[PDB]
Amino acid sequence: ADTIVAVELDTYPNTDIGDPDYPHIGIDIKSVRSKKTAKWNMQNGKVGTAHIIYNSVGKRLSAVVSYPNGDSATVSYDVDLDNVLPEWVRVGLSASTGLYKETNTILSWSFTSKLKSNSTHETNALHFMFNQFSKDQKDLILQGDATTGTDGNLELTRVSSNGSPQGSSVGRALFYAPVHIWESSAVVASFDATFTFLIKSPDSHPADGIAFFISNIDSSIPSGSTGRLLGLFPDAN
Numbered sequence: 001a002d003t004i005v006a007v008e009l010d011t012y013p014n015t016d017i018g019d020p021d022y023p024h025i026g027i028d029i030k031s032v033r034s035k036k037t038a039k040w041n042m043q044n045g046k047v048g049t050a051h052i053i054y055n056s057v058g059k060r061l062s063a064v065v066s067y068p069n070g071d072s073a074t075v076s077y078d079v080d081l082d083n084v085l086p087e088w089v090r091v092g093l094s095a096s097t098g099l100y101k102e103t104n105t106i107l108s109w110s111f112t113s114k115l116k117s118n119s120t121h122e123t124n125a126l127h128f129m130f131n132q133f134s135k136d137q138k139d140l141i142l143q144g145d146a147t148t149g150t151d152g153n154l155e156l157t158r159v160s161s162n163g164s165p166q167g168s169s170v171g172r173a174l175f176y177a178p179v180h181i182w183e184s185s186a187v188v189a190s191f192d193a194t195f196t197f198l199i200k201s202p203d204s205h206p207a208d209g210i211a212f213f214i215s216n217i218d219s220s221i222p223s224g225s226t227g228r229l230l231g232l233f234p235d236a237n
């Protein structure tokens, strides 16, 4: 299977697989069953911002998700990602819907990874920023139902022409270039990601969420990973 590290914005409590009984943000290390969660107020129809931060010094993967009214949720988890991820990864966004649904609209996404080795600024770095997506976004690998639009957005999961999100959808977007996420001689290996998103649902209980994830370079949507598996995992183990 793929190796996945993810920050999930999980809109739908699947309490049978260890979700807390509320929408939550979570840090997922090789399992959809978050190692750490925090209660999250998803604001229907509002634009949220997720920030994900990690560095190999503090070895603490942190995320905050906020809305313009100042509400936010944060989760941090101490983890040495050297021992979790392969040296080379791809980074992406993933989302799903299920029996319940929501738009999983990404309005922007940025990412920075740096490897700072030994001495003065001999550093490798990758940064990308999308504040507008184009219909044919050649530097994104779109998987599943994910599309980019003339509207400038990345719709991770299916949305009708009429703007209605569809159930049973899963989609991801990975940045085209592999990322050298850590390296043995790197004194600091850090990454940061930010994305903004608009989750809107007619459903009184939207589902299923959006994740920022880091995976092996050849990561693909696992079979049967709509709904609670967020397009990240082949099962709920």
Ligand SMILES: CO[C@H]1O[C@H](CO)[C@@H](O)[C@H](O)[C@@H]1O[C@H]1O[C@H](CO)[C@@H](O)[C@H](O)[C@@H]1O
Pocket (backbone or CB within 6 Å): 012, 014, 097, 098, 099, 100, 101, 167, 168, 169, 207, 208, 226, 227, 228, 229
């Ligand atoms: C009730 O459980 C389903 O829906 C929730 C909310 O969307 C998901 O978290 C959960 O994984 C289940 O989704 C599966 O079943 C749905 C139909 O019941 C289907 O639409 C989904 O694609 C998924 O297979």
Ligand SMILES: [Ca+2]
Pocket (backbone or CB within 6 Å): 010, 011, 012, 013, 014, 019, 208, 228
């Ligand atoms: Ca869930």
Ligand SMILES: [Mn+2]
Pocket (backbone or CB within 6 Å): 008, 010, 019, 020, 024, 026, 032, 034
């Ligand atoms: Mn969860």
